[PDB]
Design an enzyme around this catalytic site. Structure first.
Site, PDB file in Angstrom:
ATOM      1  N   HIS A  40       0.855  -1.220   0.000  1.00  0.00           N
ATOM      2  CA  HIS A  40       0.000   0.000   0.000  1.00  0.00           C
ATOM      3  C   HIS A  40       0.876   1.250   0.000  1.00  0.00           C
ATOM      4  O   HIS A  40       0.706   2.114  -0.888  1.00  0.00           O
ATOM      5  CB  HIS A  40      -0.943   0.044   1.199  1.00  0.00           C
ATOM      6  CG  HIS A  40      -1.815  -1.154   1.314  1.00  0.00           C
ATOM      7  ND1 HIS A  40      -2.291  -1.594   2.533  1.00  0.00           N
ATOM      8  CD2 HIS A  40      -2.273  -2.023   0.385  1.00  0.00           C
ATOM      9  CE1 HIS A  40      -3.006  -2.688   2.351  1.00  0.00           C
ATOM     10  NE2 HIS A  40      -3.021  -2.966   1.041  1.00  0.00           N
ATOM     11  N   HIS A  80      -9.008  -1.308  -5.371  1.00  0.00           N
ATOM     12  CA  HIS A  80      -7.947  -1.712  -4.409  1.00  0.00           C
ATOM     13  C   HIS A  80      -6.965  -2.687  -5.062  1.00  0.00           C
ATOM     14  O   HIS A  80      -5.743  -2.574  -4.849  1.00  0.00           O
ATOM     15  CB  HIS A  80      -8.523  -2.335  -3.135  1.00  0.00           C
ATOM     16  CG  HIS A  80      -7.469  -2.606  -2.115  1.00  0.00           C
ATOM     17  ND1 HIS A  80      -7.000  -1.629  -1.251  1.00  0.00           N
ATOM     18  CD2 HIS A  80      -6.740  -3.712  -1.863  1.00  0.00           C
ATOM     19  CE1 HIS A  80      -6.055  -2.141  -0.488  1.00  0.00           C
ATOM     20  NE2 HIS A  80      -5.875  -3.409  -0.846  1.00  0.00           N
ATOM     21  N   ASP A  87      -3.161  -2.271  -5.113  1.00  0.00           N
ATOM     22  CA  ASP A  87      -2.203  -3.362  -4.798  1.00  0.00           C
ATOM     23  C   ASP A  87      -1.164  -3.556  -5.910  1.00  0.00           C
ATOM     24  O   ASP A  87       0.018  -3.743  -5.590  1.00  0.00           O
ATOM     25  CB  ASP A  87      -2.952  -4.671  -4.588  1.00  0.00           C
ATOM     26  CG  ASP A  87      -3.189  -4.983  -3.127  1.00  0.00           C
ATOM     27  OD1 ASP A  87      -2.647  -4.258  -2.275  1.00  0.00           O
ATOM     28  OD2 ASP A  87      -3.899  -5.972  -2.849  1.00  0.00           O
ATOM     29  N   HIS A 124      -0.246 -10.981  -5.795  1.00  0.00           N
ATOM     30  CA  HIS A 124       1.104 -10.503  -5.422  1.00  0.00           C
ATOM     31  C   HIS A 124       2.145 -11.313  -6.184  1.00  0.00           C
ATOM     32  O   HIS A 124       3.107 -10.720  -6.703  1.00  0.00           O
ATOM     33  CB  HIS A 124       1.306 -10.633  -3.920  1.00  0.00           C
ATOM     34  CG  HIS A 124       0.384  -9.768  -3.131  1.00  0.00           C
ATOM     35  ND1 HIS A 124       0.297  -8.399  -3.331  1.00  0.00           N
ATOM     36  CD2 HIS A 124      -0.479 -10.056  -2.132  1.00  0.00           C
ATOM     37  CE1 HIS A 124      -0.575  -7.883  -2.487  1.00  0.00           C
ATOM     38  NE2 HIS A 124      -1.065  -8.879  -1.736  1.00  0.00           N
TER      39      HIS A 124
HETATM   40  C1  LIG Z   1      -2.813  -7.440   1.911  1.00  0.00           C
HETATM   41  C2  LIG Z   1      -3.230  -6.922   0.534  1.00  0.00           C
HETATM   42  O1  LIG Z   1      -2.704  -5.606   0.327  1.00  0.00           O
HETATM   43  C3  LIG Z   1      -4.709  -6.884   0.415  1.00  0.00           C
HETATM   44  N1  LIG Z   1      -5.445  -5.777   0.198  1.00  0.00           N
HETATM   45  C4  LIG Z   1      -6.742  -6.127   0.144  1.00  0.00           C
HETATM   46  C5  LIG Z   1      -6.797  -7.466   0.343  1.00  0.00           C
HETATM   47  N2  LIG Z   1      -5.549  -7.914   0.496  1.00  0.00           N
HETATM   48  C6  LIG Z   1      -5.215  -9.316   0.730  1.00  0.00           C
HETATM   49  C7  LIG Z   1      -5.365  -9.608   2.200  1.00  0.00           C
HETATM   50  C8  LIG Z   1      -6.491  -9.378   2.998  1.00  0.00           C
HETATM   51  C9  LIG Z   1      -6.187  -9.800   4.277  1.00  0.00           C
HETATM   52  C10 LIG Z   1      -7.004  -9.758   5.500  1.00  0.00           C
HETATM   53  C11 LIG Z   1      -6.615 -10.498   6.607  1.00  0.00           C
HETATM   54  C12 LIG Z   1      -7.368 -10.443   7.775  1.00  0.00           C
HETATM   55  C13 LIG Z   1      -8.496  -9.633   7.845  1.00  0.00           C
HETATM   56  C14 LIG Z   1      -8.865  -8.880   6.740  1.00  0.00           C
HETATM   57  C15 LIG Z   1      -8.108  -8.932   5.569  1.00  0.00           C
HETATM   58  O2  LIG Z   1      -4.906 -10.238   4.195  1.00  0.00           O
HETATM   59  N3  LIG Z   1      -4.387 -10.134   2.975  1.00  0.00           N
HETATM   60 ZN   LIG Z   2      -4.052  -4.464  -0.395  1.00  0.00          ZN
END
Ligand SMILES: C[C@H](O)c1nccn1Cc1cc(-c2ccccc2)on1
Ligand SMILES: [Zn+2]
Length: 299
Positions: free
Chosen positions: A78, A237, A241, A264
């Site tokens: 981010h 989003h 990302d 990713h």
């Molecule tokens: C982490 C990445 O930047 C991302 N942005 C939006 C979704 N994601 C993937 C993602 C989402 C989560 C997550 C883990 C626990 C609670 C909520 C969300 O963990 N990785």
């Molecule tokens: Zn993200």
């Protein structure tokens, strides 16, 4: 000419790791020309510096992770997009803990932090990587590609298999601008679905996410009492990302990128695949802001 940029002042922010769930202090400091973005773990003796490059990415497991041996800096994407978005070429990034703070789940707190501190221009031309011919990668049902465009364009398309989407697939296609990035891509929070979220927490993994910093989605509808910041939020989003992972090329890009259910892993994959294809790209700098096809928020 379009000069390289840095931070005018120091910025500090404190929050928690989504995955790690540990309190962390993030400090951003200005750096010299040709430096790039360096992640530093300042709680270690001696301090461990991982420059933000494609070859330092080891772990792509629901976050982008830079590896120097047994020390890792987690969830970098981010912040690197905010920096990609406002055009910060060189800055020092210092972490008290292994994982960068999730903030409110978007690139928005970092944009507000960087806009307030301010941008500084530098006496050096800003290098760009110009995409000469198409580069691609496939992994089963997910796909990613670099293609020529006169500017920077990110297009995206995703086949989420959830009831909330009304059986439709999501699609957005952004033309890169500082203004373009801030007003329509920057506030796109991260999202979690209840199915994936259950098994992570019982194992003390992903302990950091909640309604306060993420989108908690149940089969029936989005549980967050104020819904979506944009009608378009999920897919934007995924654009937020991708911009962050591509910027681990270390240079800004002058091509159109298309992602289809890309994550990713594939994002990092296309970078290395690209670099190897030397015929595929060339380096370019610009003499005038007009000649240049990309506008960054004037310092
Ligand atoms: C982490 C990445 O930047 C991302 N942005 C939006 C979704 N994601 C993937 C993602 C989402 C989560 C997550 C883990 C626990 C609670 C909520 C969300 O963990 N990785
Ligand atoms: Zn993200």
């Amino acid at each position: 000419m379009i000069k390289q940029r840095t931070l005018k002042n120091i910025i500090r922010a404190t929050g928690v790791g989504l995955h790690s769930g540990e309190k962390v202090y993030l400090t951003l400091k200005p750096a010299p020309v040709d430096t790039g973005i360096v992640f530093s773990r300042t709680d270690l003796d001696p301090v461990v510096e991982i420059p933000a490059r494609a070859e330092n990415v080891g772990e792509t497991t629901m976050s982008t992770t830079l590896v120097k041996g047994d020390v890792k800096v987690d969830t970098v994407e981010h912040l690197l997009s905010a920096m990609a978005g406002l055009g910060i070429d060189n800055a020092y990034v210092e972490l008290s803990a292994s994982e960068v703070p999730i903030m409110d789940g978007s690139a928005g707190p970092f944009v507000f932090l960087i806009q307030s501190a301010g941008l500084q221009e530098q006496e050096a031309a800003k290098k760009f990587i110009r995409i000469k011919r198409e580069v691609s990668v496939e992994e089963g049902d997910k796909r990613a590609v670099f293609v020529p465009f006169d500017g920077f364009k990110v297009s995206f398309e995703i086949d989420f298999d959830h009831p909330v989407f009304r059986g439709r697939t999501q699609q957005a296609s952004v033309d890169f601008s500082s203004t373009s990035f801030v007003k329509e891509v920057s506030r796109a929070r991260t999202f979690g679905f209840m199915r994936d979220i259950e098994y992570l927490r019982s194992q003390n993994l992903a302990l950091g996410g909640s309604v306060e910093n993420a989108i908690v989605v149940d089969e029936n509808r989005v549980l967050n009492e104020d819904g979506l910041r944009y009608e378009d939020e999920f897919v934007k989003h995924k654009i937020l990302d991708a911009i962050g992972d591509l910027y681990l090329l270390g240079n800004s890009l002058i091509g159109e990128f298309r992602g289809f259910k890309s994550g990713h892993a594939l994002n990092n994959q296309l970078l290395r695949t690209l670099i190897a294809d030397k015929d595929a790209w060339e380096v370019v700098t610009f003499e005038d802001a007009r000649t240049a096809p990309i506008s960054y928020m004037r310092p």
